[PDB]
Amino acid sequence: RTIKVFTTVDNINLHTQVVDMSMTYGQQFGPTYLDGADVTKIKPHNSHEGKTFYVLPNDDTLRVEAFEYYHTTDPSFLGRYMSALNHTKKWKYPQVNGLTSIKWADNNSYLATALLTLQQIELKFNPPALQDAYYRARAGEAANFCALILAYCNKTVGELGDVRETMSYLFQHANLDSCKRVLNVVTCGQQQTTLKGVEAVMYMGTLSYEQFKKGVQATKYLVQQESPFVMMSAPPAQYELKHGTFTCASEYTGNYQCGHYKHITSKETLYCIDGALLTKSSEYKGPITDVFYKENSYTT
Ligand SMILES: C[C@H](c1cccc2ccccc12)N1CCC(C(=O)NCc2cccc(F)c2)CC1
Ligand SMILES: [Zn+2]
Ligand SMILES: [Zn+2]
Ligand SMILES: [Zn+2]
Ligand SMILES: [Zn+2]
């Protein structure tokens, strides 16, 4: 007639529940999840004894636990998170060239590119959930991390995606306090701008950091930079990537609707990771759209 299970919103604060085995999880707790799976319309099974189930933050204390773990106020988050998990737990996360990648599935090229990128850039997350999941991802267990990335990016599994937007959302939940950017426009008169938060490390309209320092078009040029990396993005275009001149890059092949992402890293030679696939070469030219670089500080 009963079993003892645990209910949680963060899988940190576990709450003991006695569950009647004659009623579904849905009737007793509302939407209920077991490792991403929806058990709402399912009655308890004997194998569920002792197991931890996700519920939704329907009171105030659960909302606070959810905020302090996910740094989110969105109630659907948990639900969306769970959905992603149920799929991303079945993905494969092989090591390629010393990095955790994703075997291709559900149109996830942009997630694999973003993940490899994050692993090659100095970035600490703010939300405890992201910290724990990213730690586990770097160790080859990236299911939770990817499901969370989907959840924060308000994207569902199987849906094509943009790496630059993904990095945008991620950086918003990252510690960029030590970052600052300063630019100028050369319109009559001095027009210096200081940029903080995401816009201190992201730029759209050229792949070339050095061009950003020389100026793009009125002309705008980088006066000062304090960050551990930078991301230079531009609409996909033919571009040459020379070993040692960059850290990594996103290649996009296709049109605005249907496309494919590959990842270019600068180790000893140029490496190209495409999910589980890996190739090497001495040089590379192709359609690039994001290029990452390592900076500590810059002054024009
Ligand atoms: C980096 C690239 C991009 C960025 C900027 C301009 C682009 C022009 C043409 C093609 C790609 C361009 N980016 C790649 C991923 C794209 C994407 O997620 N497409 C999904 C999609 C699916 C259906 C309709 C749609 F408008 C968009 C969005 C665009
Ligand atoms: Zn509690
Ligand atoms: Zn059964
Ligand atoms: Zn906090
Ligand atoms: Zn699936």
Author numbering: 3 to 188, 191 to 221, 230 to 312
Passage from the reporting paper:
The papain-like protease (PLpro) domain is part of the SARS-CoV-2 non-structural protein (nsp)-3, and represents an essential protease and validated drug target for preventing viral replication. As a conserved papain-like Cys protease from the C16 family, PLpro hydrolyses amino acid sequences with a specific Leu-Xaa-Gly-Gly motif, found at the junctions between nsp1/2, nsp2/3 and nsp3/4 (where Xaa is Asn, Lys or Lys, respectively). Importantly, the same motif is present within a subset of human proteins that are also targeted by PLpro/nsp3; most notable are the C-terminus of human ubiquitin and the ubiquitin-like modifier, Interferon Stimulated Gene 15 (ISG15) that comprise a Leu-Arg-Gly-Gly motif. Moreover, the fact that PLpro also acts as a deubiquitinase (DUB) and deISGylase, enables the exploitation of many tools and assays to measure PLpro activity.
We co-crystallized 3k with a mutant form of SARS-CoV-2 PLpro in which the catalytic Cys111 was changed to Ser (PLproC111S), which we and others found to yield a more stable enzyme. The best crystal diffracted to 2.66 Å, and structure determination by molecular replacement revealed the structure of the PLpro bound to 3k. The new crystal form (space group P21212, see a list of all SARS-CoV-2 crystal forms in our associated Review) has two molecules in the asymmetric unit; both molecules are superimposable with an RMSD of 0.51 Å, and show excellent electron density for the ligand in identical ligand binding sites. The (R)-enantiomer of the compound was used for co-crystallisation and lies in the binding site. 3k occupies the channel required by the enzyme to hold to the C-terminal tail of ubiquitin and ISG15, which is on two sides lined by the static core of the PLpro Thumb domain and held in place by the more flexible blocking loop (aa 267-272), termed BL2, an extended β-hairpin that folds over the compound binding site. Tyr268 at the turn of BL2 restrains the central piperidine ring, almost entirely burying it in the enzyme; the piperidine amino group further forms a hydrogen bond with the side chain of Asp164 of the Thumb domain. The naphthyl ring extends into a hydrophobic pocket towards the ubiquitin binding bowl in PLpro, packing against Pro247 and Pro248. On the other side of the molecule extending towards the catalytic Cys, a substituted phenyl group is connected to the para-position of the piperidine ring by an amide-linker that forms interactions with both the domain and BL2, including through a key hydrogen bond between the compound amide and the backbone carbonyl of BL2 Tyr268. The substituted phenyl ring extends outwards from the domain core, due to side-chain rotation of Leu162, which blocks the path to the catalytic Cys111. As a result, 3k and related compounds appear to wrap around BL2, remotely from the catalytic Cys111 (closest compound distance 9.7 Å), yet directly competing with ubiquitin/Ubl-tail binding to the protease channel.
